Write an enzyme that holds these catalytic residues in place. Sequence first.
Site, PDB file in Angstrom:
ATOM      1  N   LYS A   1     144.142  67.374  55.532  1.00  0.00           N
ATOM      2  CA  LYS A   1     143.466  67.970  56.676  1.00  0.00           C
ATOM      3  C   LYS A   1     144.024  67.358  57.973  1.00  0.00           C
ATOM      4  O   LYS A   1     144.774  66.374  57.943  1.00  0.00           O
ATOM      5  CB  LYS A   1     141.940  67.791  56.557  1.00  0.00           C
ATOM      6  CG  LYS A   1     141.406  66.354  56.557  1.00  0.00           C
ATOM      7  CD  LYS A   1     140.187  66.233  55.624  1.00  0.00           C
ATOM      8  CE  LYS A   1     139.097  65.317  56.174  1.00  0.00           C
ATOM      9  NZ  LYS A   1     139.612  64.003  56.690  1.00  0.00           N
TER      10      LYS A   1
ATOM     11  N   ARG B   1     140.150  62.491  45.487  1.00  0.00           N
ATOM     12  CA  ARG B   1     140.564  63.095  46.751  1.00  0.00           C
ATOM     13  C   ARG B   1     141.223  61.977  47.569  1.00  0.00           C
ATOM     14  O   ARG B   1     140.569  61.208  48.279  1.00  0.00           O
ATOM     15  CB  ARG B   1     139.353  63.681  47.475  1.00  0.00           C
ATOM     16  CG  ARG B   1     138.586  64.701  46.634  1.00  0.00           C
ATOM     17  CD  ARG B   1     137.519  65.409  47.459  1.00  0.00           C
ATOM     18  NE  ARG B   1     136.623  64.458  48.096  1.00  0.00           N
ATOM     19  CZ  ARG B   1     135.631  63.820  47.482  1.00  0.00           C
ATOM     20  NH1 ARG B   1     135.391  64.036  46.198  1.00  0.00           N
ATOM     21  NH2 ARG B   1     134.884  62.948  48.145  1.00  0.00           N
TER      22      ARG B   1
ATOM     23  N   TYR C   1     149.754  54.526  89.183  1.00  0.00           N
ATOM     24  CA  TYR C   1     148.497  54.986  89.761  1.00  0.00           C
ATOM     25  C   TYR C   1     147.562  53.847  90.149  1.00  0.00           C
ATOM     26  O   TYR C   1     147.401  52.877  89.415  1.00  0.00           O
ATOM     27  CB  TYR C   1     147.795  55.945  88.786  1.00  0.00           C
ATOM     28  CG  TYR C   1     148.454  57.306  88.728  1.00  0.00           C
ATOM     29  CD1 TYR C   1     148.326  58.201  89.791  1.00  0.00           C
ATOM     30  CD2 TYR C   1     149.284  57.665  87.659  1.00  0.00           C
ATOM     31  CE1 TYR C   1     149.016  59.410  89.801  1.00  0.00           C
ATOM     32  CE2 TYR C   1     149.977  58.871  87.663  1.00  0.00           C
ATOM     33  CZ  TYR C   1     149.843  59.735  88.736  1.00  0.00           C
ATOM     34  OH  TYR C   1     150.572  60.897  88.764  1.00  0.00           O
TER      35      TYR C   1
ATOM     36  N   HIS D   1     130.544  62.291  48.362  1.00  0.00           N
ATOM     37  CA  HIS D   1     131.449  61.482  49.141  1.00  0.00           C
ATOM     38  C   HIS D   1     130.721  60.196  49.546  1.00  0.00           C
ATOM     39  O   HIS D   1     129.544  60.231  49.920  1.00  0.00           O
ATOM     40  CB  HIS D   1     131.876  62.297  50.365  1.00  0.00           C
ATOM     41  CG  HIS D   1     132.987  61.679  51.146  1.00  0.00           C
ATOM     42  ND1 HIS D   1     134.254  61.506  50.629  1.00  0.00           N
ATOM     43  CD2 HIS D   1     133.020  61.176  52.403  1.00  0.00           C
ATOM     44  CE1 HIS D   1     135.019  60.922  51.534  1.00  0.00           C
ATOM     45  NE2 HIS D   1     134.294  60.712  52.620  1.00  0.00           N
TER      46      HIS D   1
ATOM     47  N   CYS E   1     150.469  56.996  82.621  1.00  0.00           N
ATOM     48  CA  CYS E   1     150.446  58.341  83.181  1.00  0.00           C
ATOM     49  C   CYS E   1     150.349  59.426  82.102  1.00  0.00           C
ATOM     50  O   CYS E   1     150.339  59.137  80.902  1.00  0.00           O
ATOM     51  CB  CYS E   1     151.679  58.538  84.057  1.00  0.00           C
ATOM     52  SG  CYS E   1     151.748  57.305  85.387  1.00  0.00           S
TER      53      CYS E   1
ATOM     54  N   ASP F   1     152.548  61.761  81.237  1.00  0.00           N
ATOM     55  CA  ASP F   1     153.790  61.948  80.479  1.00  0.00           C
ATOM     56  C   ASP F   1     154.735  60.742  80.430  1.00  0.00           C
ATOM     57  O   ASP F   1     155.769  60.771  79.750  1.00  0.00           O
ATOM     58  CB  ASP F   1     154.529  63.178  81.040  1.00  0.00           C
ATOM     59  CG  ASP F   1     153.568  64.267  81.520  1.00  0.00           C
ATOM     60  OD1 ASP F   1     152.853  64.874  80.687  1.00  0.00           O
ATOM     61  OD2 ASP F   1     153.518  64.505  82.747  1.00  0.00           O
TER      62      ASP F   1
ATOM     63  N   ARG G   1     125.993  63.752  55.641  1.00  0.00           N
ATOM     64  CA  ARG G   1     126.828  64.738  56.328  1.00  0.00           C
ATOM     65  C   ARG G   1     126.536  66.177  55.842  1.00  0.00           C
ATOM     66  O   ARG G   1     125.773  66.907  56.477  1.00  0.00           O
ATOM     67  CB  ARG G   1     128.299  64.362  56.120  1.00  0.00           C
ATOM     68  CG  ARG G   1     129.267  65.053  57.059  1.00  0.00           C
ATOM     69  CD  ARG G   1     130.590  64.347  57.036  1.00  0.00           C
ATOM     70  NE  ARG G   1     131.165  64.347  55.696  1.00  0.00           N
ATOM     71  CZ  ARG G   1     132.403  63.931  55.518  1.00  0.00           C
ATOM     72  NH1 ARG G   1     133.008  63.539  56.602  1.00  0.00           N
ATOM     73  NH2 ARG G   1     133.044  63.919  54.350  1.00  0.00           N
TER      74      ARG G   1
END
Lengths: 382, 380
Positions: free
Chosen positions: A38, A218, A264, A165, A310, A312, A135
């Site tokens: 997942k 799992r 910044y 689970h 920042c 990027d 859950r």
Amino acid sequence: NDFHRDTWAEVDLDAIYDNVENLRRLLPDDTHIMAVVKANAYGHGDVQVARTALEAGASRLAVAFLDEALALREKGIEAPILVLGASRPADAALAAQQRIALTVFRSDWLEEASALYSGPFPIHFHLKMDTGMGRLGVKDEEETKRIVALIERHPHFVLEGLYTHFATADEVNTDYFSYQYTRFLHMLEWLPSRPPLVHCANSAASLRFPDRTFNMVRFGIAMYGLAPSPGIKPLLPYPLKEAFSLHSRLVHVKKLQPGEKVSYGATYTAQTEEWIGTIPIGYADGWLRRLQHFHVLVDGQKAPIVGRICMDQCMIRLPGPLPVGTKVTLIGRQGDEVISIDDVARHLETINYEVPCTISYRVPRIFFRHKRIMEVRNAIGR
Amino acid sequence: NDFHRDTWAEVDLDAIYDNVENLRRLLPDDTHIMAVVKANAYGHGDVQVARTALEAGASRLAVAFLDEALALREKGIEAPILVLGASRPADAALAAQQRIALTVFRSDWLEEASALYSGPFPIHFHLKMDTGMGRLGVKDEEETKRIVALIERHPHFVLEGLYTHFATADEVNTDYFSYQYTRFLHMLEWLPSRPPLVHCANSAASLRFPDRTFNMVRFGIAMYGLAPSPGIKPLLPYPLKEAFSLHSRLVHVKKLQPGEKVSYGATYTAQTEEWIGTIPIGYADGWLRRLQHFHVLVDGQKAPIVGRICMDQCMIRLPGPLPVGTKVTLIGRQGDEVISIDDVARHLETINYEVPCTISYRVPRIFFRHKRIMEVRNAI
Ligand SMILES: Cc1ncc(COP(=O)(O)O)c(CNC2CONC2=O)c1O
Ligand SMILES: Cc1ncc(COP(=O)(O)O)c(CNC2CONC2=O)c1O
């Protein structure tokens, strides 16, 4: 596939093969392995990890919601897939047509789905029990029997599985684990008959107690070579091989004079004559702002991130004048030094699961198999 | 497209249109608006936002690196695009062919691009100057002249513009700002002729000092309806409309008895008779674990996230027994209450910029324009 920024993540598929194969060795032959991919295989690349896991011994795949299962089908995966989470009753026909098993935990869902579907494909259900996680899942005997009856009455509904689970399988202290396992055992008796697949174990439970897994595990986090928690590292049967590494390159290098500010809010100020390097990776890449007091590896040495991060790019103090294009490693090994996902996790104050998942779509994934590049996957690619 | 999980983001393009058109009104006819659309338009959707901004008055677009620009081109955008970050000299030919302008800041880059590219398309360059930000940019006089000379000297190289970026434009205290503004005016004199596009302002400096923005404004965060900082908020000329909201639906509801535990590590213990709901959103969706004590909205009320947040799911303490399918608003408005991105950022201890960016590819974006559903974008 191609990419045009010098920032990329590498995924070592040999490591993934090893982690899964060692489990196939460890578990009894009659116990199957459901590899859970997942969240795009925990940020590693869904179909690539799926193909590899199936090679090493896995027979089924697990995903969080329907779209993820359908995406695997479109890329040619024909193995069984189980949707661990919730789905819409209206989507039952599509799941059945694409041979995707569903998790069910309430009768009103089934009431609603019998009314919208009538063959010809069978839908395989896995009854989810809530034994202490809180859950999803059934918690009473009247509801458990209602679901089973509704499934028994429709000719195209099939109960293929039953699972629960654990919430604390990764804790050295097994008190809550025991309450849950015992409760699962009590709850299984509420069913008229055992379906073919009974499962409960995640990575932690199956690596610590292989004999207590019933017939299917799992396997998630450990497949990627990451320990379920800091608690159980020494309790692990075989060494785990980390598969994810993150890299970049210096795109700008410059020397500052004493008193000049960086980034910044102009937070950082150089105090002697220092070399500052700029790398093309920022928070929109999953390299979050909270990592501003962390470090990266440049030419076998630790170098701190300087100033604020920042969107990027970010700056780092260099040991001295290094050439533009020098490889920088954010997660991975460079010589004798190494930065692991757990290190990043500690600084971010999270668990290792959250780190690769946050490295975004913007960052290309380069796959290695047999020590050679297999494919490049750039999500915003042409 | 369509999606098969009840978790989705909603992007209000009308809000984005108003934020841009108001600036277009507030600025001089001569001045261009370059909509910054990097990082998938700050997590709002690159084409959908770029298109909307162009309709509102923007004439240009800005992206972070080459792949983001090529992506806009492949989706039909034919407006000008400037790459604000770095690129490889070897990709200058691709940029040219696709009409993408590049940022330049080092003379060795050009020397290398020159040897590799001979023509036939022209490549428009924007000379980035570092005026105290310390990120990218040229800092000395003779590096500037060498760049200008290398460009002038090549038949297909054109210097279209030059710019700088302010580190503290969102700060009330304009003292470092005035130092950078002054440094810039000074560095502009190292150029023989002033190029056609001179820009310096981000959202903050353009909304605070619109006349000292030369002839092009780079408009980012404010376009999305978010303030550059909490301090700049009551100094802005017009009200910003917030464009991004996030929603989910209850997929399970149950009553817990005292002593019963919830989620990983069993760190939450039910003390009374509580109704607990499970929603299908988790940290792989960008709803980070740190949001554990935060409040979401259900049926007009604040409801706390109880227990640890999982990869794809999390639990909340409900006001009472609500039906499965009930809408939960994580960011947005539910009648009387509102949770803004600034609220989420407060709890995550970050700035609003980081929030929509982090919500992942896994979350579909539903677009609204002219008050109607226009499009659904599901990445997987
Ligand atoms: C039902 C189910 N089974 C197995 C797994 C695999 O766990 P591991 O990767 O530790 O072996 C998960 C992961 N679900 C997660 C993981 O984090 N939060 C969740 O809800 C799961 O939800
Ligand atoms: C070169 C450049 N110009 C303009 C902008 C727009 O900024 P605003 O959203 O405040 O109007 C940015 C964004 N750069 C960012 C934003 O956050 N971190 C960065 O490196 C930019 O890098």
